[PDB]
């Protein structure tokens, strides 16, 4: 099952073979072995193909690299010619526009109904949207590229028959596709010419005289690539179309000033990048890489100017000039081409934009493509600075180790009582005895002479090898390395030239874990503590190239299975015990903080910062520096040789990259046991590897920063998020220091702290770059957020431009695609301040995805029609339009709820869906459809998913494919699970036990499904359900041989019939509904009552007569009502008659505002808004089960059956042991005062106070987003509740009649189950 999006790096080594089978020439690979190797059984029969022979009968023998041609194809290809796809994508374009315009509707109708709307209304709104959509630059190109993607996926599917060949002829270009390979035939007149007369692309393969007689009387030339550059080009076209459409649409909301850059500057940037690439090949990405730092530089200069504020821009300009001049001297550019090539960075430098527009422009970096990777350059990059001699100072290592031990001691003192009973000689610490005897811990100021004494402190094993309660860490479907005995079996046995003597069997983690005869944690401890990773057969460590990136090449390492288990164990132990004395992320904006709290921990307060790159540390770590820390980590546990596996085993390995189509150079059968080293192999790796031992390295970095803070008496805070580390210095000033000298002093303090840290880190063997480390005062960019003097900057193009009709959602499921689009829409609307661009994009893509899946489904046969085989008549526009309006909870396909524009977390997904459906049906004159559209027919669901889906309905159309995958995994486990520990957990009567437990959990009166769901996860059945879920993609269902050895029936037919049944469930209407529920739902006119009746009628077999409580909640849109008062007015509601309400008022102080105060989104204000593994789960289970039921004497007769399966301690000993967020930027929330105490008796109650504040703030932000701040004519707002959906909640407890009457004492095995 080929995928529709890029998921692998781009390598073109095998394309050398293809050109040899067709009598052409192309030097993609740097390995000479591929020049004269035997050809495989396939890609050799091309000599007997008539289509390929006819296609290449009028072209030169020489070819050209695809690096220089992709920009030419991106502009020379449009949909005009003939394509072999009969249902063409552009045919269904009017319906897409109609649906998009229909969503520019009710969204607006819903918004007006709520009370937000907009003061400024323009009549010409649909016409502008229609013109913006119609007049897009990348529309027909996008449709043509989607036809190409469909056709090439269909071709890749077979790749063994006569149906694997396709041909397209479009104006100037010809394309021939054959089984993962593409031939492009293009005119020679489109290629830029070198000053010697030959094209720029041909100057690296042929000499000038050679590439002048090969062409001669030829006008067309051929390039060869894989069927993965096509997918990349399709992704680029989709992203460009999305960003252009969003930028154009945003100009209608706010004509005066929008937050998106423009739709004309971005086009020029695209053209300039394309020209630069067409001239420089894949080498031109080194200039494209500079867009992000230049954007950051331009953002930094949008504030008060300081002498060192412009240093970042100057350094980046110098760097880009040097890079441009170094990669151009060899190439013989024309004098005219040397002027046009300096237009990308020249345009970037001369920009004049607001900080918000620059922040949005930051997000277009992958819109030009990705380079072609080689296994030689990638390994030469990491070899050059991993076998390098280093010079170190022992003294700084000494203080670093002392600070390490100090931090550990302080963390153990702060919690768990005081001190840790040092079992060491008291002579060797003359000065720490006083603090120990009086039980006191020394503060920082006087710890400068007793630091060395911390070296002499000893203790027992403070931590333990326990608290591991997640078995999914040992089964994750990752990649491992083969054993040393058979290491060259990962190469194709024709490029190698010999058959490898030994062949492996399996290479997947889940299959090897399910075959592990003797598992358990103590076995891993015994394996590591005996130095069994040094065995001769456990030393491979292969490499693998990274995914989509703009680097020359990056790699990640793979180890054999037991060593991978040891690494996972070490990371798990170190994450819990240590790595807590060293807080990783402490991201904070001191601008929006209150006084008397920052100053208290800072001993006016001004803070500066600087950011360093923590990735380059990995290769600079040596054993001579990290030995003491590793030994101390060993001592703090009971282990002996566990934490030093990497430094012991990595240097003894043979470094190589496991690429299928090119092995290491000069590899034969004779020199197989002791292979030589060359341009892609080496032996003495002395540094670290990415990902391995990350927590220890972060702890060492934190210790170094703390040492610098001790030496230099400044308050320092360190935060780590990703590959960057931010260090913030707090200055503290004696007041009466103006406001300009204070910032200069803060910057000077930050600079001196940076210098001291650089000195210390260099003395430890790790080098920082003074020309790449830079000091910021107010602008802080970190992790997922950027701030400019306390004002948050928008970033919505990151997720909005990734919307596409095709994704990887298990057998091309429509529901998964629509859910992904909805999630992207929510995440995009969370940022920024505009609304309509993202929703218009999502509405455009939803219908198009529906049509693609209806007509071109890869899982079925060619020419199939999903909409015809189910209804029997063509699927019209009305049926699809009505199907997408019903929310998914009730069995529809609607994933874009307008109510998500206010808050992201929803109290009740049923009442909100009912309200949305009622509003949509009220907009149109189709009111008499509400009843025969939500009744439906209840399905056949047992009491196993009611626990898993507490707030839901028993409809068959609202489910997903999780249960199918769970059944597949369960049967695969049943057939082959010789793990000897999974078998104990998955016994013969596991299903019956789980069903009985779930049935008993819902036997109370009244029934509370939330409590049952909460408590079910701590049972062994919950652990079984957690383990069962590890499948994620639609390729393990087919490629995994162990799954497909169950015989029975093929999974393809079952998937097809499930898809047909699901497609028949939707779009049918009035065919899967009953009449008893419809008659019982009449004359209700209340959403809460309707939801309660719907929940009661469903699950009727589960809930015979017992009422259900704790599920239904009201919809806040129907609960409150805004009034929008002005200064000289009085509320009409308050004058009449108890009228509880919530008050919202607007402040006046601005504090900071960038660039102006015209928009309320650009400004801010004052604002303000060791226990074992199973012991825990036992304790919380007992606590909650005791808390829920209190008015009974059975609280002791129900704890025992659940507790006896988790912990050895009996009852009466455990007894002794016993966020909703919002989708708006946090800028207006600092300028509003929300008062809820005016409600009086609070109408406990049926109101969630966590969401009322969000609703009020979001309403105010949406109402005034495109209006001037001085034009706002409203002062305060009243939210008056209506007495129609508000009720009181009396206190009520749970009464249990019987007991489980089930034996769970058989679970006396280790891991995620009962421990002694």
């Amino acid at each position: 099952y080929p995928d529709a999006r890029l998921s692998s790096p781009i390598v073109l080594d095998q394309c050398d073979l293809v050109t040899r089978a067709c009598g052409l020439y192309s030097s993609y690979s740097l390995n000479p072995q591929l020049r004269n190797c035997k050809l495989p059984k396939h890609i050799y029969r091309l000599k007997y193909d008539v289509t390929v022979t006819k296609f290449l009968s009028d072209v030169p023998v020489a070819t050209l690299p695809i690096d220089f041609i992709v920009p030419i194809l991106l502009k020379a290809l449009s949909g005009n010619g003939f394509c072999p796809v009969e249902p063409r994508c552009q045919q269904f374009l009017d319906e897409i526009i109609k649906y998009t315009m229909q969503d520019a509707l009710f969204l607006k109708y819903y918004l007006k109904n709520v009370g937000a709307q907009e003061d400024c209304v323009d009549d010409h709104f649909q016409e502008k949207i229609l013109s913006s959509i119609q007049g897009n630059e990348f529309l027909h190109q996008m449709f043509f590229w989607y036809d190409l993607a469909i056709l090439t996926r269909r071709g890749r599917l077979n790749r063994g028959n006569s149906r694997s060949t396709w041909f397209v002829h479009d104006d100037l270009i010809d394309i021939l596709g054959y089984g993962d390979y593409v031939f492009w035939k293009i005119p020679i007149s489109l290629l830029p010419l070198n000053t010697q007369g030959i094209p720029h692309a041909a100057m690296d393969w042929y000499q000038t005289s050679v590439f002048k007689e090969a062409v001669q009387g030829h006008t067309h030339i051929v390039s060869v690539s894989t069927a993965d550059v096509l997918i990349m080009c399709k992704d680029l076209i989709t992203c460009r179309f999305n960003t252009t459409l969003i930028s154009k649409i945003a100009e209608v909301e706010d004509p005066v000033c929008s937050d998106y850059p423009n739709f004309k500057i971005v086009s020029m940037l695209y053209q300039s990048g394309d020209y630069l690439l067409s001239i420089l090949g894949s080498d031109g990405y080194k200039i494209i890489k500079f867009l992000e730092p230049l954007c950051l530089a331009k953002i930094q200069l949008c504030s008060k100017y300081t002498e060192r504020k412009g240093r970042f821009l100057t350094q980046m300009h110098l760097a880009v000039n040097h890079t441009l001049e170094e990669i151009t001297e060899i190439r013989a550019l024309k004098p005219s081409q040397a002027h046009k090539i300096r237009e990308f960075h020249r345009t970037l430098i001369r920009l004049e934009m607001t900080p918000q527009q620059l922040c949005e422009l930051f997000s277009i970096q992958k819109h030009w493509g990705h380079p072609v990777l080689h296994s030689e350059t990638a390994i030469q990059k990491v070899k050059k600075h991993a076998t390098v001699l280093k010079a170190l100072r022992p003294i700084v290592i000494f203080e670093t180790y002392c600070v390490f031990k100090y931090s550990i001691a302080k963390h153990y003192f702060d919690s768990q009582g005081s001190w840790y009973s040092v079992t060491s000689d008291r002579n060797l610490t003359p000065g720490l005895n006083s603090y120990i005897k009086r039980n006191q811990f020394p503060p920082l100021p006087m710890i400068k002479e007793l630091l060395w004494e911390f070296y002499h402190l000893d203790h027992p094993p403070l931590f333990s090898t326990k608290i591991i309660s997640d078995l999914s860490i040992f089964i994750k479907d990752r990649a491992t390395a083969v054993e040393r005995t058979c290491w060259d079996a990962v190469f194709e046995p024709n490029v190698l030239g010999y058959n490898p003597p030994h062949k492996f069997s399996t290479k997947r983690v889940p299959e090897q874990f399910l075959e592990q005869e003797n598992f358990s944690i103590e076995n891993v401890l015994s394996y590591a503590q005996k130095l069994e990773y040094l065995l001769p057969q456990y030393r491979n460590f292969s490499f693998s190239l990274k995914e989509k990136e703009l680097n020359v090449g990056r790699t990640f390492g793979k180890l054999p299975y037991p060593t991978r288990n040891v690494q996972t164990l070490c990371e798990a132990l170190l994450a819990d015990g240590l790595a807590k004395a060293f807080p990783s992320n402490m991201m904070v904006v001191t601008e929006r903080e209150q006084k008397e709290s920052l100053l208290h921990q800072a001993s006016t307060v001004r803070g500066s910062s600087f950011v360093t790159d923590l990735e380059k540390y990995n290769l600079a770590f040596r054993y001579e520096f990290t030995a003491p820390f590793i030994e101390y980590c060993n001592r703090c546990y009971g282990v002996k040789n566990v934490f030093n596996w990497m430094h012991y085993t990595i240097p003894q390995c043979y470094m190589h990259v496991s690429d299928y189509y090119n092995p290491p150079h000069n590899l034969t059968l004779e020199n197989r046991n002791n292979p030589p080293e060359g341009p892609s192999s080496y032996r003495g790796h002395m540094g670290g590897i990415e990902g391995l031992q990350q927590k220890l390295w972060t702890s060492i970095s934190c210790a170094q920063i703390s040492l610098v803070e001790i030496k230099t008496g400044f308050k320092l805070r360190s935060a780590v998020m990703g590959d960057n580390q931010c260090i913030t210095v707090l200055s503290v000033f004696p007041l009466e220091t103006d406001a300009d000298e204070q910032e200069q002093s803060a910057e000077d303090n930050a600079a001196r702290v940076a210098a001291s840290l650089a000195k210390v880190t260099s003395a430890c063997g790790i080098f920082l770059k003074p020309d790449e480390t830079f000091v910021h005062s107010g602008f802080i960019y970190f992790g997922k957020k950027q701030y400019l003097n306390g004002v948050q900057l928008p970033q919505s193009l990151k997720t909005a431009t990734r919307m596409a009709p095709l994704s990887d959602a298990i057998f091309d499921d429509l529901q998964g695609t629509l859910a992904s689009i909805g999630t992207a829409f929510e995440r995009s609307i969370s940022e920024t301040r505009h609304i309509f661009p993202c929703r218009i994009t999502a509405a455009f893509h939803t219908f198009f995805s529906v049509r693609i899946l209806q007509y071109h489904h890869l899982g079925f046969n060619k020419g199939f029609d999903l909409g015809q085989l189910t209804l029997g008549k063509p699927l019209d526009f009305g049926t699809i339009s009505l199907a997408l309006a019903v929310p998914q909870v009730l069995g529809g396909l609607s994933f874009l709820n307008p109510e998500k524009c206010f808050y992201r977390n929803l109290g009740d997904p049923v009442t909100s869906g009912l309200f949305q459906l009622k509003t949509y049906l009220r907009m149109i004159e189709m009111d008499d459809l509400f009843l025969p559209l939500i009744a439906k027919n209840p399905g056949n669901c047992t009491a196993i998913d009611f626990v898993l889906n507490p707030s839901g309905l028993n409809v068959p159309g609202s489910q997903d494919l999780t249960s199918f995958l769970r059944q597949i995994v369960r049967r695969t486990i049943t057939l082959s699970a010789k793990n000897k520990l999974i078998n104990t957990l998955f016994h013969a009567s596991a299903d019956f036990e789980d069903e009985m437990v779930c049935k008993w959990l819902l036997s109370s009166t009244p029934v509370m499904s939330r409590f049952a769901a909460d408590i079910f996860s701590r049972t062994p059945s919950g652990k079984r359900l957690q383990i069962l879920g590890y499948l994620e993609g639609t390729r393990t269902l087919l490629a995994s041989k162990i799954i497909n050895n169950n015989t029975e029936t093929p999974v393809l037919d079952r998937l097809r019939k499930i898809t047909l049944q699901r497609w028949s469930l939707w779009f049918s209407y009035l065919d899967h509904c009953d009449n008893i529920l419809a008659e019982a739902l009449t004359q209700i006119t209340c959403t809460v009552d309707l939801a309660q009746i719907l929940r009661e009628y469903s699950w009727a077999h589960i809930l015979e007569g017992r009422p259900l409580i704790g599920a239904t909640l009201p919809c806040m849109i129907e609960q409150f009502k805004v009034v929008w008062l002005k200064p000289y007015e009085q509320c009409p509601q308050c004058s009449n008659a108890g009228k509880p309400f919530v008050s919202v008022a607007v402040k006046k102080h601005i504090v900071s505002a960038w660039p102006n105060a015209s928009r309320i989104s650009w400004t801010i204000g004052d604002g303000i808004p060791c226990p074992s593994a199973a012991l825990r789960e036992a304790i919380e289970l007992a606590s909650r089960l005791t808390w829920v039921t209190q008015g009974s004497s059975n609280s002791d007769l129900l704890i025992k059956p659940f507790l006896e399966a988790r912990v050895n301690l009996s009852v009466q000993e455990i007894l002794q042991m016993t966020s909703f967020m919002a989708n708006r930027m946090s800028n207006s929330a600092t300028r509003l005062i929300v008062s809820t105490n005016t409600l009086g008796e609070f109408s406990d109650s049926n109101i969630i106070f966590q969401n009322v504040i969000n609703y009020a703030v979001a309403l105010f932000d949406i109402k005034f987003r495109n209006t001037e701040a001085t034009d706002i004519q409203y002062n305060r707002a009243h939210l008056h509740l209506t007495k129609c959906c508000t009720r009181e909640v009396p206190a009520q407890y749970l009464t249990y009649t019987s007991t489980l009457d089930l034996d769970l004492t058989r679970y006396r095995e280790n891991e995620l189950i009962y421990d002694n």
Binding site: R311, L318, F398, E624, A627, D748, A763, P770
Partner: protein, 260 residues
């Protein structure tokens, strides 16, 4: 008789008692001498705490030093002998004194290995770092000219000649930093690059009362096309800050001046 014997016995008892008293006095003298002789020992404990602290410091430091290196570290004689076999630093960590290796680096007489000298140079290049000049860029004439070209639109304009003249004069007077700082300050306010160059010419004291340079050309073809529209007759007393950027001297004696 009996009384005389009693008297004699009493006298003997008195003499023996006196001898015992003398012995007791000697005992008291010896005891007080021993008690007074212990004064130096009492103050000995004062000078031992400092020794204990210093010894504990040295023990901690050298224990960490010996533990951080391997079981095979090689001695000074071993590494000196091994240096005679190629560069080839010996296996295992070697220990050097900063002054000794620093002094040996310049004294290139006994074939110090290249890797060792690169490592020492990288280690020592970070010592000369202060609060100032931490990340201060270095600007030369060519780099400044390249930066200045990136702002002016088009090509062949007289502003390019002005930029070249400014860079040459700054290189001659060694004032590139001041010129660059003035240019950046002018650009920050939002002025056009041409205005920034004009302000640089009119503000920097070096360019004040400076004779414009003279460039020799064979004919009108040397000058760019964009510069062709800014030709004037040469004034008797041209000034660089008044508008004249350069004077073109032809082979036949014709003199032309370029003005913005």
């Amino acid at each position: 008789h009996s009384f005389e014997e009693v008297v004699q016995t009493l006298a003997s008892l008195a003499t023996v008692v006196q001898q015992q008293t003398i012995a007791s006095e000697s005992l008291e003298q010896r005891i007080t001498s021993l008690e007074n002789g212990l004064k130096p020992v009492y103050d000995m404990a004062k000078t031992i705490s400092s020794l204990n602290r210093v010894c504990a410091e040295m023990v901690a430091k050298y224990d960490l030093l010996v533990m951080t290196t391997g079981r095979a570290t090689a001695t000074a004689a071993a590494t000196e002998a091994y240096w005679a076999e190629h560069g080839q630093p010996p296996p295992g960590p070697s220990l050097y004194e900063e002054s000794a290796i620093r002094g040996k680096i310049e004294s290139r007489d006994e074939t110090v290995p290249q890797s060792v000298r690169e490592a020492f140079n990288n280690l020592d290049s970070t010592t000369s770092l202060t609060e100032e000049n931490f990340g201060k860029p270095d600007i030369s004439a060519k780099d400044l000219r390249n930066i200045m070209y990136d702002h002016l639109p088009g090509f062949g304009t007289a502003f390019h000649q002005l930029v070249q003249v400014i860079c040459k004069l700054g290189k001659d007077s060694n004032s590139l930093d001041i010129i660059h700082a003035e240019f950046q300050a002018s650009l920050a306010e939002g002025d056009s690059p041409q205005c920034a160059l004009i302000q640089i010419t009119k503000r920097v004291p070096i360019f004040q009362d400076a004779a414009p340079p003279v460039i020799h050309i064979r004919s009108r073809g040397d000058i760019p096309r964009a510069c062709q529209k800014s030709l004037r007759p040469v004034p008797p007393s041209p000034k660089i800050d008044r508008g004249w950027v350069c004077v073109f001297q032809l082979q036949d004696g014709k003199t032309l001046g370029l003005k913005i």
